[model samples]
Structures are given as C-alpha cells and as structure tokens.
Target: ETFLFTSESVNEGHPDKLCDQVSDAILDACLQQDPESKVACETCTKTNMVMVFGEITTKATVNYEKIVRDTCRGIGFVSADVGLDADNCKVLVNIEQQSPKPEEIGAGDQGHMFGYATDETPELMPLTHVLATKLGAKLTEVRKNKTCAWLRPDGKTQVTVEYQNDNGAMVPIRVHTVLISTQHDETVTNEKIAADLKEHVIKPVIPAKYLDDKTIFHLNPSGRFVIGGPHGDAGLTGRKIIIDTYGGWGAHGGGAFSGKDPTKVDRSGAYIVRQAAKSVVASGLARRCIVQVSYAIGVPEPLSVFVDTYKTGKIPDKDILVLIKEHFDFRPGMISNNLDLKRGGNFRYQKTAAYGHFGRDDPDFTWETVKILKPKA
Candidate 1:
C-alpha cells in the first residue's frame, strides 16, 4: 500500500538561522583570503549583542565587527528594537588563530553530516517542505517588500499533512496544519497581524485548492511576539539542523553546517550530496532520494556514500552509484570549487543563513540546480 509524505522549512531570520549566518560569514571570509584556513567558529545572540567565538588557523585577519553587523543586517535585521535590529547591535568576537597540530591538520573537529532529496518537487524537495518554505519565504518577503510592514525578523513555520489512500494507492491528501509564528512591531496587534499574515504571507504561498473550512492556520498562537530574536532567547550555531536540512523527512548526522570551513565536510558534504540527490530526481532516476556521506577528519575523501530511492527508480540504483563515485569528487577542495563557496565577502555562509538555504532558486545556491545527467527516459 502507498502512503502520503510531508516536510517543512523555516525562514532565514529564525533565531537558529541568524546564528548560522554569523558563523558562516566568518568562515567564508577566512576561506576567501586563505583557502587552507582551518576554522571552527560559533556565534551566540541575545538581545542586541552577538558574541562569536571559535578557533581558526590562517594568515587572514578578518573584520569581526563588519562580519557580524553585515550578517545580521543582511538577514533583515535593522537598528530599531532593543533585543534585535542590525543597526544598533553590538558584536563581540573572539578568534583563536593557531596552526593545527600535525595530526589534526585536514580533519574536522567532530561530527556527522547528512543530505536528502525527493521527486515531489522540481527541486527534489518534499511537498510539505516546499509549501512550508514557500510560506516562510512569503512571511519574510512581505516584510522586506513592505507588503506587510510590521512583520519582524524572527519567525517559525510548520506544515503537516494527512495521507488519503485510494484503494491500495496513495492519492489525495489533507493539509493537517499550517502554522506560522512571527514577531511583529509593537504597534501591530495580533489580530491585525493574523489577518495580514493570511492575506499577505499565507495567501501568496499556499495553493488555493488546499484552503478550506477544515484547513488549519495558526499565527502567533501565544499572542504577543514583540519579544523575539536574541532578547527573547539565546541562539547558537547548528541548533536548527532539522530545519536547515530536510525538516523531519530525512535523517541528520548531528554535525552543524554553519561556521565551519568546507574542509569540515559537515557543511560542504551536505551541499554535495543534496546536489547528487537533485540530479537523481531531475533525471527521473528516482521519485525520492536521500544521499548520505561519512568522512574521516583530515582525510580528503568521504568514508562512505549512501543513497536510497523510494522505489521510483527508472534506472538501477547501482548505475547511479557508479556514476556518482566516478563522476563526482567529494574531496574538500573539490566541493568548495564545485559549489563556488568562495564567492562574496562571507557570501557562501551569508546566503544560506536564512530561508532554508537549500531548494532555493537563488543563484548563490548552486547545488539546487538539476545538472546530474541527461535521462534515458
């Protein structure tokens, strides 16, 4: 019997994404100036101040103040509120730049990484996640575009679905829930925000046919959200791994993707595998794909490559595996070069910090492309 599936994504200004961007910006800066730089940085945000601390070994001297400020500003934060806003935010950065031990050179600190894909969408992303991300992106776009002026930078979104079986096959399904919790300016009342959220955020992203009397839309369930961002709570790097990757649809390797150089594999490997998975779906090789990689620290190659197709295979998985193994280079330097992580001043890390970095059509997101191979079908 067949079954339905779902997934979800969050906005870039979400607390966790805020931290991820900060960490990655630093990594990008260091990597740009010194490709061989060893970096492992972390950022903490609370109220109006952001504190960044990490270890690095490189010849480049970075501007922590600019990196932190610009990262926050780029993520849609402005200098307006006390707890949030990029303008008045204070940045405290501590960098420990030291050469790695002979044995530690080229190895990651410690962690596992994972990647996933599905044929449910053109991006190979799950439908639930695709809608959720659309919803979340709409939430932020309205704010940035002034469609609804009061929407703040911090927010959360979730999409849930109920499977409907037709005879023995999966067919139509119901949207169980679409939850959006966003911080708004003090002048904006919950009632007004909710109404506008539906009109501006929800309406634009969600498909029309899905909305019905039975549909659930939760906006700021707890009432006032004036207290958000760092002030409402402290945010750290890699905490939103689930949201960053495949929501709950795919497995995670426990390694955070932000704030580390590509050599670490946690960040770069994830991007590479996602690209591989997208190719499988684009080529009609699979309806759903989850690609995984394990790496040995300091080693130039991944330890293992794992791919699973949810029975939507046009070609044998073995051939695809052989193609990946032969055609793709999973090495540290190779990933950086392939994905163009070296773009912009902290651009690589800066871009993914918000809006569920993957599945995005943004030019900076090269992995989102479906460049696998010409399909036989």
Candidate 2:
C-alpha cells in the first residue's frame, strides 16, 4: 500500500542545537588552541542561565564562559527579557581539568550510527527531509539576512508529503501538510509574519506546483512564541537525532555526535555509512539506500554493517552490501584518515552541530562526498 512519509527539521537556533553548538564551540576552541585536546563537554541551559559540565585533557587553557556566551549570542540570543540571551545569561563552567595523554589513541566511546539517502532529490535525500532542510535553511537565512528581522532565533519546520501509488511507482501527489513555528519578536503581527514567511522562506524552497488551495501551512499555530530558546524549553546536547539525519526515514544507532572526536566510530562510522549510501545511489546501484553500522564502546571496528534499499535496485541487497563492504572503509582510523575528519575537523564540527552536519553539498560537507563520483567505483 502507498503511504505518506514525513520528516521534521529544526533551525540552528533551536534549543538543543543551540546547546550542542555551545558545547562544540567550546570543544573547537580547545582543539584549536591545542590540537591534541581531549574534551567531553555537555551543556544545559534555560533562559538566563547555562550550566556546563564535562571532562577535559588539554595543554591549552580555554575560556569556557566566553565561548559559551559568544556561541549563544551569535545564534540571535542577545536580549535578556526574551528569556535566553548571551549578554545576560549566567554561565557555569564545571569542567574537570586533566593531564593530556599524547599517547591517547583509542575510541573515546562507542555506539552505532545510520546514514541514508534516496534518488528522490538531487541531494539524494528523501523528499520530506529535503523540503524540511530547505525550509530550515531558509528559516535561518531570512533572519540572518534581516529579510524578516522580527523572526526570532528559535524555530521548527516539519514537512509531510503524500506519495501516490501511480501504477507500480511512487510519485509525489501534494503537500499533505506543513508546519512551521518560529519565535517572533514581540512587535510583529501574526498576519505580517505569516505573509513574509510565505513570501521569503516557504515560497522559494517548496516546489511551486505542490502549492494549491489544499496545501496546509501552520505558522506559529499556537499563537505568539515570544518566549522560546533555552528559556521556554530545557536544552541538552545530542537530543535532536531525527533532525540530524533523514528524520524518521532511516534508522539510528542511538549515538549522538556532538562534543565527540572522530575516534569514536559512532560519530565517524555513521558518517562513513552515510558516505557509502550516497555513493551507491550516485553509482546508479539503487534509487534509495539506508546503511547501518553498529559499534561497541572503546571498539575501533564496527560490530555490524547493514544496507537496505526499498527494492529499487538492479542487484540483490546482499550483492549491494558486498559492494559497500569492499568499497567503504569502516575502520575508525581509516575514516579519520580518509575524510580528514580531524583537520579543522573540530571547527567544522562545531558549526555542523548547529546547522546540520549532513546532506550539505557545501565545500565543508565531508559527508556529502560520494566516492562513486570517482572515475571507476
């Protein structure tokens, strides 16, 4: 039976991503100052206060307070009355200082990761994820560009697409539903906010034909969202797993990616599988793919590698799996070496924890690289 698929994505300034960015930024600075830095930072924030606690082993000392504040401020939180702000938020740093072990060369922790893609879009992501990401990116972009200066830092977008079973093929029918809730500055009227949002954020991203009289657009459905961010909701690191990947279209390994170095296969290995899946689609092996790699804590190699295609493949799933196993390197050190995961990798990771670290075709998007683009895959 044919069914509709849905996915949700949040803006970078969303509470959890905001917290993740803060923690990762702290980690980035520590690593930047001293490349041999070891950090396991976690942050919790609400309204005017932030609490940071974690372990650190590095030669260079870091100003954790400054990093935390700056990260928050940059994401559009500068006013105290609005609940969360960089200028007035109280930051508590409770990091355990330790001696750096230069010889430290092992997995930091262990878990599993999943990566997925499909031929549904040019980026090889599902239609739901692609639309959600486009809206998310636009949501951030419009605010940053002052297209709608009144748009607040925290916002969320969910896109649900209905696919019709046309004959034996799945084809997009229409936008079954769309929900966008963005915190707006106290002064903007709902009417104006809705108008501008459709004009600037939604219009350019969604397919033109998909919008008819029937399309559903829910903007700030519950009314004014003047109080949001860390204030309206509690925030912690690694909480938005669905937003970080293909929403619910793919499986997850129950591992979070922030504040983690690549030695942990959970972060790096999941990325490897994503990279692998994208490559297979690019090679015309399948129209859709989901790759899962499971790892144990402190283990360098993966415990399992599984690949699934929604039956749009020219070859058997097992044969495709063979190709993935032969082509992709699932080793911890190998991923780090191949993806250059550690070179300015920390800095890149910090930004990713906020804006999303996958499906970005930008120059810094390491996971977007499809080795199948190679001359001979």
Candidate 3:
C-alpha cells in the first residue's frame, strides 16, 4: 500500500510564531530570576499593537514591553516598512502576579500529553515533519545571513512524503511535494525568489534520492507576500500546536505548550514522555513507540501511563511499559527535577518555541536525549 503523509512548519516571523516567541521569552526572563516561577503567559499581536496578558507568580522583575520588543526585533520585525515596527509598536501588558501556593507547584492544570518516536529519521521524528522543519530553518538562515537579501522572515514550508509498505513495514518511498511560501521585498520577482530558493534552500537540504523529476515543487503559490507579519494576520498564542509537536504523526492532548511552566503537564509532561518513547525505540525494543500520560490538577503521580508500539514491538508492549517506568519518573516535580525544565541558563523554553520542540538536538534540552533501557540481557 502506498500513501502520502504531509506536515508543515512556520518560520519565526510567522504571526502565531511571533506570539509564541514573546510568551516564551517572558517566561525565560522570569525563570532567570526565579527558577520556581509559576507562569502562564499569553501574547497576541495585530498591526502595530501587542498585548500580553497572563497569570504569573514570581519574584523576577521583568520588563514585559522590552522583552516583546526584543523578541520582535530578533525575528526581523524591526522596521515599520515591513508591516510591524518593533521599536515603536504599542505594547500593553496586563499581568497579575499571584502568591505561590504549595499545591499549585505540583501540577498547574489537568490535562494529558503525548510523545512519539520512530526510526524513520535520525532525530526519531517523522520524515515529513523533519523535512518541513529543516526547510523553515534554512529559510531563516538565508534571511538572517543575507544569503537571500530579498527574503523576509515570515514564511512557511510543507512537505509530503510518499510511503509504501516494504516487507510489512511502512517506509518513506520518495518525496511527493515540497511547498514553500516566503515573504520577500516587492522589488524581487517571484521567478527570482523561486530560482534562489531552489538553488540555495532546497538543493542543499533535501536528499538527492528522495527528490526527483516527479517530485513537485511549489514556491509562493499565492504570488506576492509583501504585506506579511502581524499586518497581514492577527497572531495569538497556542495556535500552532500541531506544528510545535509531531506534525500530525502522533496524538496530541489539545493543550498548548508555550507560556506555561514545567508544572503544566502540557509542557513538561510532553517533554518527559517524548524521552520515554525515544528511549524505547533507541534501545531496540521497538521500531516505533507512542507514550501517553495524563495528570490531574495538584496531582504528582500520573493518572495513567500508556504505551503503544504499533505492533512492531520485539517484546510485549507491557514489557516496554515496565522498562519505561524503571528508566523515568512521570511525576510532575520529578520530571521537572530530572529534566531541569525550570533552568534558565540557556533560554531553553524560548528556543523550543520556534522550530519543532520534540526533535531538537540541543544539549541543554535533556528530553531530546534517548535513554537506553537495558532489559535483563
């Protein structure tokens, strides 16, 4: 059987991504001062106005407006000429800092989170998602380094991978489609944009075996994207949840990750479970694995922990579950302590906000590391 699976990723300058970055940036600032900061910051942007409103309890003194401006400037939203102005934009912050309660420190809210792993990619992520994310990251690179001077920050990339059953397992056969939409200066023609993208962006990243004459390429299908960023669309927090995680390859619990602290199962639990799934696959126990964990408000122990190997497990799924329990602790506080989720040293949360979070190769983000499970050899 042959089929196509597609996934998409947005650049840092994208509207929703812009909001996510700001929210995480603020979270990082608060954590820098107070590692125990309990925060759920949300941000929204439209035109030249930015609003940040959320609940936070911390001793950290943060200049919310400065963080917003700095984040915007980092994303290349500096000049008013390109839709939004980073320096002069009006920033309204409605923040209410609360007193930290003991119970609130365990779990911020009640929700479930999922993590997934597969041998299809070196990062253990789905191939389509990896391709889409790489394309977006390359777009950012060329824009930042002036490799493509006309290229703007706001952009999105989508990839479709053709899969075929090979000896009883589904594997990617070839590239089906590569679609990219990038913001650019009006002076540059779409033809020129396509040419530069093909040469500088696509050729370098995509594997030669995957791409062929039959592979379809779409560059800026709607033509001019001169008026982009917040001016083109309103951006709100948590709108790009699918893009942030597995890119439709795995299950999601309908909770947004950004602007929340480790206590929120939506953020930290997802990270921990990803570690669990990756460990299982890496240890050669399974070809694919998905881990699901649920928590209730103020509860340390997970209400339930489930594992599925998609019938590819060498051992029983029950055996894999036992290995996961021995290698990791799912309790919110334990996960926080084990992963150092609250550490502010490297601006971890801010970095994960952009690009897909789970497959990150950063050393500071411990959740990405695969812990090998040694089961009674």
Candidate 4:
C-alpha cells in the first residue's frame, strides 16, 4: 500500500519566522561580543511593532534596535507596504540578567529531544522535508534575486511524498502535492501568481522525476495576499518548532532552540543526536534512524538515550545503541563543548533560525558534521 507523508516550511518574512530571526540575531550578536552570555530570549511581532523579552546574563553592550531592524530588512520587510518597515517598525527590549554556574551544567530544561535521518534523500532527510524546505528557500531566493518582482517576503510551502513500504523500511515513490502560499503585491494577478511560482520557484527546487502529471499544486490559494508579514498576522518565538527541526518526522522535546545560548541541552542535545543519527545512516549502519535522549533539569548526564533504526540497521539495533553511547557524549557540558556550541565557534544561530537546522550544509552548523562509526576489526 502507498502512503503519503508531508512536511512544511516558512519563508524568513513570515510573522513567526520574523520573530525567530530577531531572537537568534540577538543571540549571535551577544555571543559575538560576550562569549559567556547566557541568553534565553523570545520575540513577538504584529503590525508594525516587535517586542523582545528574555532572561539573559551578559557583559556585552548590544544594540537590540539595530539587530531588529537589520534582520527584518534582510528578510525584505523594509517598507510599510510590505506590512513591516525595518527602519520604521517599533522595537522593544526587556532583559532580566542574573546567573552564575559551576563546572557542571544541567540541561536547559527538562524535556525529551529526538534526532532523525534517512537515506531517502541526498540531504539524508525525509523526502517531504527536503522538498518543502527547498521550496521555501527557493521562494525567498526568487524574491531576493528579482526573479519575481511582485513577490513579497511572507510565504509558506508544503510537500507530500508518496511512499511505498518494503517490509518495514519506507521508500518514497513520487511527489503527491506541492503547495505554496506566498504573499504578493497588489499589482500581480492571481493567474500570474500561480504561473510565476510554478516556473521560478517550483521548477528550480523540485526534481522533475518526483513531479508528474497527477501532482497537485496550490499557489497563493487564498486568492490575494497583498497584506503580509507582521502586519497581516501576529508571530511569536518558538512557534515553528516542527519546521525548525526534522519537520514532522521525529518527536520533539518541547523546547524551542532559538534565543537560548549554547550551554542549554535543548540546543546542544538535539544537535548531538542529529549528528549521531545522520552519522549512523551515512556510515551505512542503518537506512533510517532516530536517536532520542531525555534529560533532567541541572543534571550532567542524560536520563536515558534510545535508538531506533526502523528495522533498517545492518546489525541489531542493540549493538548500534552500544556504538552510539560509546562514541557520543550526551551530557550538557560535553555536548556544548564537543559540538562547538559555545560562542565564537563556527556556528550561526541566525542562519539556523529560518531553515531546517539539521539538514543544512553550512559550516556554521557544526552539528551538521557527521561521525562515521567504524568497527574495530
């Protein structure tokens, strides 16, 4: 029997994504100047205003107003016509800084974190996730590159993959649907919106083999999206967690990654597990895998580490479990250190904010680094 799996993504200018970038940009700036800042920030945006509030401890002097304006501007939210004016929008900041810790650091919060990988795509990500994420990125590219003049910043994309299950492993056969809901200026007609997206966005992103005659495409489905970004809707930090991680393929630990400093297990733990899972697949230990780690508040060691290969492992899962635990350190302190999650490292929180963090290929995403498990023969 054939089944359908779906994943979705949002463009940088979407209200929710706008808030995420603001949170992360601030984090990067703080880390750049003050390496030891413990930042836990959140953002909210609506209409022409953005408000940021968080618990942070840092000795650095950061211009929050400048970060906010620059991030929004980079996302193409430069004018009132686009629902937000980067230079003109209201900015608010509230920070409660007070903290000190010893050598051993606990998990940022008590939660379960999951990491997943598969051979279904070159990115080692689920097929639906790759397609959807690429679509959203492409949408942004077309707008920024002037491929589509009427294109606006706010956009969302979705992809549904038809899969065939062989025994227990899932195999994707083709694409079922490609949906894009993009905000556009008033000048473009509904007919052209659909045509432009298919030509400039979809054509550039999706592989033709997956898209066939029966594939469904929904572009700007609501007829009009002239008013977009924060003006059209409200957005807040951590609201797009699924899109930030493995799409909807894996379980989440209920903690959002943006705005927090690297010391938090919520950020480090997830990245380490993703490195583990991606390495397992890349090393041919499994065709598909998910690594789950649970942590306790202020605990150095994880409560438990679990692995499932979806019955796709070359060896029994029990042995693969042994291999991972030995090779990877799930402790919060080690995670922060080993993964290079600390400040001034080759990492960028702002880049990870909009795209799916796990499958990215940037050097700043050091966690995207893979570890191949070789047997000691």
Candidate 5:
C-alpha cells in the first residue's frame, strides 16, 4: 500500500535545464571581466546525474560547476526525488581546452518598429512574441547604426519572455525571454573569439524594460556558429517552417521543440507534412487547410499522412497527393535534414533550450517565404 503526501513542490517540468540555469550564470559572471571565455558550460540531466560540459580557451575565471550547483540550489533541487541535490549531485566537466582552437561570428521588428508577445490579453496577447519583435527591432537598430562594436553578419532572433499573473517566482514562469536575432551585420558569430556575444546582447535596454524580470537568459545556444545560420536560422527557409506555425492562427504541434537532435519525427515529421500541405494551399489549390500525419514504427512510410483542404480545394485530393509524393520524402524519421529544418542550424532550438526560450520563434521577424501552387486544370 502507499501513503499520500501533500506538498506541491514546484512542478515536474520546473526543475529543468540546469544547463539553462548554470550556463547562463557563467556568462552573467563573464560580463564584468570584459573578455571572451569561449565556453558553453552546458549541463544535461533529470537529476540522477547532473553532468556539465563544454569547450573554451579559458580567458576568464567563469567557474562553471559552482554556477551549476548554485543554479540547482535556487531551483529547489535539494532532494533526490525532487530531481537533484544541489549540494551532493555529481558534476562532470569536459572540454577541448587541452587542444583549444576556433571562434566565430546577427533582425527586424518592422519597417521601422517592434512588439510581440503581449500580456494585455489576459488569456494571452502573446507577450513572448512582442518582445521577440522588440529584440529584433533593437538588433536591427543596433546593426544598422553599427552602434554595437561587437556586431556580426548572419543572425536570427528568439525571445522567451514570460508574463506571470503576479509575484514572478511565487507565481512561476517569469519574463526572461532570450533572443538571437541573426544575420551578422560580423561573421564568426562565435562568442568564443567574438567575445561572448551574449554580453553585448544582455546589455540591451530592451531587456532593461524587464531586466529585473529576467528569470533565465541565453543567446546563440549552438556554442559555435562560425558557419552560422539555419542553426542560427537561415534565409527564406527558416521563417517558412516557423512563421506558418504561428500566424495569429490557432495551430501547433509537438511539445518537444525542433532541435533535440535529428530524431523525433514529431518535430521533423511534423515539419515535412507542413511543407507538403502548405504547398497545396500556398498554390491557392485551396484558400486554407490543415494536413496531419500519423506514423508507425519500423519504416519511414507513414501509417497515414494526408491533407484536408477544409472544403476549399481547387484540386482534387488524389491529384495533390500525387505531387506531394513527388516533391517530398518522409522516409527517414529525421526530416530536419530536409533543407527545411537545416536552413537554420537550430541555434534556434527553442523549447529544448529554454522550453519556451523565446516562446515565439517566428511571428514578425520571419514572414516573407510563402510558396505558390499550380494551374493543372
């Protein structure tokens, strides 16, 4: 038999991403030193084993494990069942500093403005989105003026600002939206030799509007983005997948996030299906529609992947289905390799990174890559 206990300690998902918690502080600690550390100090775990790892040239004394353990202390991970023990958890550190080498190299709010993810809606104005817009505009402003001495060439943006009912902590999910507006205006966006790009980013007054409100922060999650984009977000391809996912419309899929890896068809498969169906409506073969896929184990063949035009199909389902098979392949479980997901390196890994690192991946910053259909009457 089992007994019941009543103490609603935080939430299961709450004590997460110690990598997120500690990694951030490492950089936060770096801002004052005024030099690049060239490291990530990334962590991984559900407790059981809290391992921290990364690479760096070691310019500053940004103690990683100290930040790691302390990060857990703040998260309430003091007991095993609670996830991890802040004081006793094992911490592992790895790096190539023994070898050491390398470095690297990011918007738009409007024609001349910004605002995404709002709080006024109560139910939701999508505040995370508006701030994504804010950061984008700010970067655009920063890059154009060449005002920021540490600017670069390729970039994209991610802002994970949260809006609590009140008393941010006692409430849960504060406004710590992180951003990565890429398209370096510098190449080698790598914070390594580039000087911890985050330092310049966190310095923005845009976040100042809610600086104290920041719960957790990150920029360029990919570690080294010298080759940049697609992970850091690509050209037309980046926006096409995400912008469509959230177009002021009520549609979404996969709670896992787009970049844990090339696995999880949820993110990868969900993506290809979108490309297949959007091509239909995009061509005006229909005005609006939704297509869903159901996959089975063993093979790439979907148990069933079909499109629904919702009564607006100018083309018959049979015909459109033909072209879909012709233009696409859902064979490998990982469609992220589809040039679709690869457009950006996934330096855009939102949920996997901050869960909602910047809840709004693309609202305004990415809106130009729409496709077209045919006239096969």
Candidate 6:
C-alpha cells in the first residue's frame, strides 16, 4: 500500500517564528554574559507593539528593546508597510529573575522530550521535512538576495512525499506535491510568483528526479497575502513546535524548545537524546531510532530513558538500550556540560528557532554530531 506523508515549514519572517526568534535572541544575550543564566522567556508581537515577559534569573544585563528591535529588523520586519517597524515599534518588557544558588539551578519545569533520527535523509531527518525546510530556506534566500523583490518575509512551504513498502520497510517513493504560499507585494501578479517559484525556488531546492509529471505545485493558494506578519495575526513564542523539530515524523513530548535554557530538560534533554539517536543510527546499530527521556522539576537526573528502533535495529532492542545508557549521560547537568549547550551564546538558539532544529548540521549544534560511540554487536 502506498502512503502520503506531509510536513510544513515557515520562514523566519513568520509571525510565530518572529516571536520565537526574539525570545531566543534574549536567551542568547543572557548566555553571553552569564552561561549559568536560567531563562524561560517568551515573546509576543502585534502591529507596532512588542512584549517580552518571562522568568529569567541571570546576572547578564541585556537591553531587551535593542534585542527585540534587532531581531525584528533581521527578520525583514523593519518596513512600516509590512505591519511592524523594528526601530519605531513600542517595546515592553516584564521579566523576573530567580536564583536559588549560583552553583546549581533546578529544572525550570517537568516534561518529557523526544528525539528521533532516520536514514531517510542525510541529515537523519524525514525526507518530507527536509524538502519542506529547503523550500522555506530557498524562499528566504531569494527574498533577501532580491531575486524576488516582490516577495515579503512571511511565507510557508509544504511538501508531500509518496511512500511505498520496500522489502517490508516503508520508503519514500517521490515528491507528490510542493505547496508554496509566500507573502508578496500588491504590485506583483500571482502568475509571475508561481512561475518564479517553480523555476528559481522549487527546481533548485528539490531535485528534478523526485518531480514527475504528476508532481503538483501550488503557489499562493490564497491568491493574496499582502497584510501578513503580526499585523495579520498575533505572534507568540513556542507556537511552531512541530515545525521546530521532527516535523510529525516521530512522537513529540509536547515541549517547546525555544524560550527555555538548558536547565529545562525540555530543551537540553531533547538535544542529548538526539545526539544518542543519531549516534545509534550512525554506528550502524539501527537504521532508525527514537530516543526519549523524562525529567522532574529541579531534578538533575532523568526519570526514564527509552529507545525505539522500529524493527530496523541490527541488534536486539534490549541490548541497544543497554549500549545507549552506557554510552550517553541523561543527567541534565551532565548533558549540558557534555554537549556545551550553553556555549553557543546568542546565535545558538536563534538559529534553531527556525529550519527544523534537530537535523541542522551547524557547528554550534554539537548534538547533531555523531561522536565516538562504539556500538558493539
């Protein structure tokens, strides 16, 4: 039986993404001065107003307004005509600092984090999500480079891939459809937008082999998206969780990554497990892996660790679990220290806020690296 799997991604200019980026920017600033900073910050934006309010206990002194404005400007939200102005917008900040001890801080909250890796893509992410993210990134590139001058910052890309059973394992057959809905200027015609996207955005990003005569392309299905960003709708942090991670390929523990520091297992635990999962697959122990870890509030140790190989494992699941536990450290503090979670500073969280965090190959994302793991047969 053939199946269709779909995933969607948004540009950095997306309203919700805007909020996520802002929150991460603030987090990065705090990490710059105080690596020990504990922050669970969230941001919201609408029209010309920006509000950043969250729990942050850090010795770092950050100019909230500057970070907010700079983030807005960087996301191409500087134009007043685009509904938000980076320089002229009103900034409101309500932050709290709580420090029990400088030596150690407890988990901000209790939650489970799930991380996944697959041989489906080179990045160990689902193919559908990789294509979707590529389309989004290409859109941003074209817009920023002025290849599409009429293109606005706000846009969405969705990719649907056809899958079929191959030797009892599900494999992606080909791309079924590519959907692009980019905000454009009123002066541009939808016809041109569609053509340019197909030629410049779609063709370059998605290989031609996956695109057959039946492959469908939908550009600006809504016909118009002039009034976008926060003006079109309110923007809040942590709204695009699925887009930020595995893109519906694996189970999510319902925890958002952005706006939280490594102390919160929701963020650090996910990174640690991803490292383990990727290492498992990279070590030839499994063709696919999903690693999950749970933690309690203010606790340094994880309550549980789980691994699912989905029948694709080379070794027994029980044996794999033992190897994982022996190779990886799930304790929150150990995980942070091992992965250098707090080291990336301001740019770290900001980069992961968009473009699917886990699959990223950036040097700063140490978890993506499959390090020295000896998976014994």
Better of 1 and 6 by lDDT: 6
Candidate 2 clashing pairs? 47-231
Best candidate (score: TM-score)? 3
Q: TM per model? A: 0.87, 0.91, 0.96, 0.96, 0.37, 0.95
Each model's lDDT: 0.73, 0.78, 0.87, 0.86, 0.41, 0.85
After superposing candidate 2 on the true structure, give the runs of residues whose Cα lies further than 4 Å from its correct spot. 101-110, 165-170, 297-299, 345-347, 373-377
Q: Write the per-residue lDDT of candidate 1 for residues 211-301, one digit (tens) a residue.
A: 7789888888978876567775788988887777776776777777788776677777788888888887777777677778787766766
Q: Could you give me the TM-score of model 6 versus the true structure? A: 0.95
Which has the greatest lDDT? 3
Q: Rank the candidates by lDDT, best first.
A: 3, 4, 6, 2, 1, 5
Which 10-residue span in candidate 1 carries the lowest summed lDDT?
A: 163-172
Candidate 3, residue 60: lDDT: 89
Model 3 RMSD in angstroms = 1.8
lDDT of 4: 0.86
Query: Which should have the higher TM-score, number 3 or number 6?
Result: 3
Error at 221, model 1, angstroms: 1.5
Give the runs in model 5 whose Cα sits over 4 Å from its true position: 1-253, 316-318, 333-337, 340-371, 375-377
Task: Please provide, for model 6 over 1-377, each residue's C-alpha lDDT reduced to its tens digit, 9 standing for 90 to 100.
Answer: 89999999998888899999999999999988888888889999887888999998888878988999999998888777876888988889988876643125455578888888888778888889999998998898998899988888888999999987554345788999899999888888889999999988998988777889999888998788886788857889999989988789788888888888887778888899899899888888888889888877877667788988888888887788888899888877777888888864648889988888878878789899986556664
Candidate 4 per-residue lDDT over residues 120-204, each given as its tens digit: 8878898888888889888888887898988988888999899997755779998998889998898888999999998998988
- Sort order, TM-score high to low: 3, 4, 6, 2, 1, 5
Over 224-337, each residue of candidate 2 has an lDDT whose tens digit, in order, gives: 888678776788988987777777776667777787666656677778888989998888887777888876665555678888877876678788888888887777777877
Model 5, span 51-151: residue lDDT tens: 65555454455566676677556544555534456688676655344222111010000011011122222212243444443454455355446566344
Candidate 6: how large is its RMSD?
2.1
